[PDB]
Every structure is written in structure tokens, then in C-alpha cells.
Design a binder for this molecule. Sequence first.
Ligand SMILES: [Mg+2]
Ligand SMILES: [Mg+2]
Lengths: 34, 52, 324, 141, 109
Amino acid sequence: ELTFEETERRALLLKKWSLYKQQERKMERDTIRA
Amino acid sequence: KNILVRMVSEAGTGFCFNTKRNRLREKLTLLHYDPVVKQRVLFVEKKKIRSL
Amino acid sequence: RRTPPLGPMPNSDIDLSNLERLEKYRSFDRYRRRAEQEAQAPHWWRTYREYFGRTQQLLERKQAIQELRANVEEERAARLRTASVPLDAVRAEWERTCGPYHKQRLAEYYGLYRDLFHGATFVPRVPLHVAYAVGEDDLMPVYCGNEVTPTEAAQAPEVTYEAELWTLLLTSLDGHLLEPDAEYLHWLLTNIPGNRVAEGQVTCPYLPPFPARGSGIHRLAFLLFKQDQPIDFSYQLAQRTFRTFDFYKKHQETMTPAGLSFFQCRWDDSVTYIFHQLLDMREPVFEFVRPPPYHPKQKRFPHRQPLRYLDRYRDSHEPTYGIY
Amino acid sequence: VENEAVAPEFTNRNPRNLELLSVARKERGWRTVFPSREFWHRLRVIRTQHHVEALVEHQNGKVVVSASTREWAIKKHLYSTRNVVACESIGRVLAQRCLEAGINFMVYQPTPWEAASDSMKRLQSAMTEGGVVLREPQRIY
Amino acid sequence: KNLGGKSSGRRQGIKKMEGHYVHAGNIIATQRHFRWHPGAHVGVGKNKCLYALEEGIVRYTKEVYVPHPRNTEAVDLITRLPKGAVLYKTFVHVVPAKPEGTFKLVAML
RNA sequence: ACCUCGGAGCAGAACCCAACCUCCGAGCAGUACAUGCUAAGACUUCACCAGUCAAAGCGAACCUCAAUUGAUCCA
RNA sequence: AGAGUGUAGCUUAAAAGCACCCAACUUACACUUAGGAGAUUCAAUUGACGCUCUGA
Ligand SMILES: [Mg+2]
Ligand SMILES: [Mg+2]
């Protein structure tokens, strides 16, 4: 079983990881093109 | 190989329809529409007309 | 013989030996999108359609969206698929911002413009809230093409057009019993002093809708015209006949169509009373008659035809005996 | 009586007359192509990258009604315009617009995956509870 | 050594060319494969024959081809098609001539 | 050697085309038991026989395969 | 010092569509479903904040 607070923390974890790896892939592609 | 079998209505009506089945499968029972009763009733294989 | 194509053949520009290199539709969805776009695009070959066919606003909207994003409860509900929307507020904002265009689309679909104004269009900028008072407690609203029974429309409606000289007209577009290209005028309040409607001039008294039985669904339109400058206007059915196109041709300079609202009515018991008492006539009853079934010319020898062939061409089912 | 002068044949010019009487033709062909044209009104849902569109379109192609998350009125009351919440909200708004427009029946033609989608299920439920039956009456011949 | 091949011609093909008035139920074209695809107001029989579902005029057109999502072979062909490509097929259409019916005054109650 | 039936060339494009011409095949199988009843309009192997498709309707649910067969009489 | 100038990666898009990413189904990819971020450089058509090119 689980709780609402940890579910919300997990959702925010997914959100921030999405942003972080989006920036990672963006910088990788920038280096590739450069 | 298959055999032609007369499926007879269990509704008591003399309604018979011929179907086919494997000669090695068990005697066959269906839910077939009986026009006399105007309803799907059980039909049970009665006799083997011929071997097809 | 090989007549050359009369234009760019489809799948011509893309066609190239580098099929392996070219990216492909990996999804039926993207293929369908492209195919639909191509179908919409015009073509030189025979096709189905031929035969059957500011900055402040942006800033404020961005700030509002940012505030909604910041609101944690909103995000919690969104990710828990439990958030809802205020339907009434959405309706009001639709009216204020983009309601006129969708209402214009509805009117065009219903054929109001092609009939009321013979094709000429106009955006109903001014929202028009019309409601037929039902009982002494409620009132059926007439939004756009909704269904309101003549029983409910027995008494004249309450109109609240928010503005600050107006003319309101109720016109039945397809209720005319004698002339296909004619309308019926029901009530015309002209020179209305702004929002309040009780002070308008009663050019024509209110006549409730009377869609004949078995005559189908009839469409009635509330036309609202802003009156630049006040102007003068000029139970018998011949005088209730009305061509809105001619009327607006006469009053075009001083009138501008700024509001629209229509509803659909079918026959009801109240129509009988309207016909018998108010109009003092025998109510007409119409029926939908399909064309008679087609049969090929009867042959002397209907070869290979069933016995029903002769029944297809006999008129009377009762036995006949000729001379006997 | 002069007022009793009625033409023998009535000419109802309302486009929706026969459709509402359930007598108008509805294209029965296109049995080898998708979607089927056998309808008077179709609910077409377009899920873009950022936005969700829900149109009620007549067989002739005229978009009778529309509900897009790209309108300010709707987009200013929900968090994300590309989620199940957005689809449910646009479905309810479209149901209200259809009821006020007189459109009570439609023919939804989703692909297998679209039908299995949770968002499409929510949109269909929203329309049903709003008062639109996604199954047009059979034509009367 | 070579036996058979004595079958006669099926007499298949188009029975109603474009512009021909067609009554409901008339067979427009008989085909062994899908040469002409069904269009508006045209139905397909079990043997792929196209019959008129309405009374009107036959029109042949070229229209984009969008198979049913459950037609696995066609969906696979599409999935392998390059982007920008659109399939086209010949479709048969019946432009209905007469209206569904007319409203007639039946009784002046 | 063949005799009936179907697919492909000859017969490139509506239909149709011979050959003791070139090649492939068939004389089933499988799934279901509304593979129920009726009924406009059409197709048709160049006749007939036979063979095909089918709107609408009643009643119900919410047929694949090219051939895959055979009349009358009589049992 | 001068020229081209200028919407998130792309758009003879006008704040959109394609793009793009992780989660699940996939060995994997792909599809599909769920979600994610995103811009019209700043002031009155004009001037000046940033990029490219031509030079030293
Ligand atoms: Mg041959
Ligand atoms: Mg013949």
C-alpha cells in the first residue's frame, strides 16, 4: 500500500526528471550539431 | 472426415435440420432457432443421414 | 495510348530511389491525417467533393496559466484525473470571446444566412439571451437551434440583450403554407431603447409558432439589429407573410445585424388552438409521401421470375372476375 | 377563407428536417474504407501534441459544432490542455454545446486504440452524461 | 500433359458506366478482385460486386484510400509507406436523383 | 492421351474468344448453428437448365476459401 | 567598421502543427496509452539587444 503524499512526491520526481533529461538531451544535440 | 446428422428439436416440435460433424466427435447438441416455437431451443443429434 | 497527366500526379515528388532512407508512416493515425489533408486539398481529377460537395491579452493569459500551474491542488487533481471545469463560467467566457463565430457557424449550417439574407453572412457580435417563460416559475432558453415546443412558446419571450436603439424580429423560415420562398413574421419590436425591451414599438403583435402537423421541424430565428439612427417602419396570414431579405434591403443603411438566436419547433396540441381560434382556419395536416416504388416495364413472359412478379404489377388485391 | 390557402405540397427548407424525422439518406457505402460515412453527425476527436479538439461535423463536412482546448474560455480553467482531465472537460463542454445546438445523436468512429484509450472513454462518458447518445437512429425507409 | 484451362469467361466488369441512371439494387460492376472500390450509396456483395444502394447517377472518381484499422494487410502496407505518400483507388458513387420524399397536404382538419 | 469445374497467359485497354496450345490447380477443409424467414432491383459463362449479388421488412444478436459438383425419374 | 538580419529544433502557422523526452508493451525498435517542457530580444512601420558573413 501507499499514500497520497508519497504518490505526489513520485509524480514530482517524474516531472523534474523529465525536465532534467530533456535538458541533457538538448545539450547533447547542441554539441552534436556544433 | 465428417458425417451429416439430423439435429432434432428438443422443443417437442418435429423440426429437424441437417448439420455436419466429425465422425470421431461426441454426439452434438446445439441451440438452434425453431421457427415453430419462434425461439432458440436445444437440438440433439438423432441419426446419421450419410457420411460426407 | 497514354494521355499525359493534367497535373502533378500524387506521390510524385516524394518518389525517389532512396526508399530505405526515407522515413515512413509508422502509424495508421499519421497516415490518416495525411490522407485526410490530401482529400481536402483540391485535385485535377474527378473527386467526391465535385459531385456530392492583443499583447496585453497574451500577457494576462500567460500569467493566469502560470498561476494555475503554481496552484498545487490544481496539479494534484490533474495528475489524479479528478479536476473539473466550471461549465457556467466556461459558457460565459465562450459567449464573450468566441461565441459569435461558433454561432455564425451554427447559423450557416442551419441555412439561416442562405435564406434570411440570401447568402450574406454576419458575425452575431452581441449575445442574445431569449427565453420563453414556462409556467410562472421557469423559462425555456433559446440558445441556437434548440427545440422549444409551441406550447412553451405560447407567450412572448423575455429578451435580455446586454447593450446601451435596437430592433428584434422573430421569423419562421420554413412555416409558410403557400409560398416556398417566404417567411412568417411573429413579433417585431422596433426602436427598442437599449437593454429594456418592454418599451419597444409593437409593429406586429406576437403570434405563437404554428408548425403544421406532419410538416417536419421548423426553424425560427430571433434577428437583432443595432439601429444607428431611429427610423420609422412602413392575425391575417397574408399580412403576416414577410420577406426578411426585402425588409433588410429597405432598412440596411440604418440597421446592422448584431444578434442572432434561433430554435426548432414541431407540431404540438397548442398549434391546433392557434390554427382554430387565433387564425380561424382548418388546421392543415401534412404527411411525408415517398415516391412510388420503381418497377421495370412488365414483360409478357417474365422468364425466371417468381410468381410474385404479377403481384408487383397488379393494383387491386381483391379478386376480379371480368365479364363474369 | 383566404387564410386557408395552403399549397398542396409543403417545402420545408430546414437542413435538419429530414435528419430529425430520421428519413434523410445517410451514405451507406464506403464498406472498404474507414471511417464509415453512414451518419448524419459525427463526433471527431483530434489529439494534437498540445491541444485537444472535439468537432461535431455533418456528413457534408460542415463543422456544426466545435470544442477546442485552444479557446481561452476553456484553456483558462484547467491545468494541462493535453490530459484526461482536458479531454473530459472538452467532452462536457461539447455536450452542453450540442444540447443547446439541438444535436442529440452522433456516430463516434474511434480506432481500436482510441476506443481503448482512457481519455476517449472519459470523453464518451462525459457526452453521455451531458445528454448526447453516440448512436444515431436508424433511417426510416 | 496440360489438362484443364477450359473455364469460360466470367463476363465480369462494369455494368453501368458513368452517367448511367441506376435504380436501387442494380449491379454496377462485377469483379473478382477490388478493381473499383465502393463509394457513396454503393454496396459490396459477398463476391465483391458493386450494387447501387440508391437511385441515381453513377460517377467514377479517384479518392484517397484509408483502410479499416483492423485490415491488417492494408495497415501493414500503410505502415511501410514512406511519409507523404497517399494511396488512391477508383471509387464508384451513386449521386441520388430523387428526394427521399415530399410533404403533401393530406387532410384540412 | 483426354472427356466435368476453377486461376493465369495466348486474349496488354468494356465483354467474349480455338487449339491432341503453354502452365497451375478441384472433386475438400475449417469455423459457427438466425449457415432463420421474407423481399425491391439487378447480374449471368454467349440458348435453356443451372448459377450469382441484394436494398427494405419480420425475427435475432449489439460465414472463410477460385473451383471444392450431378438434373429428371426412381428409391 | 559595414551587410543580412531575428517565433522553443523546422515552418511564403497566425501564440498553432510537426518535431523532442521519460513511464508501461515490447530483447530492442516501432505502434499504442499515460504524462512533460517549451518561444514571437527590448522601446516607439521605425530605432537599439543577440546570431551569421565581409575586414583589420
Ligand atoms: Mg482460361
Ligand atoms: Mg444469358
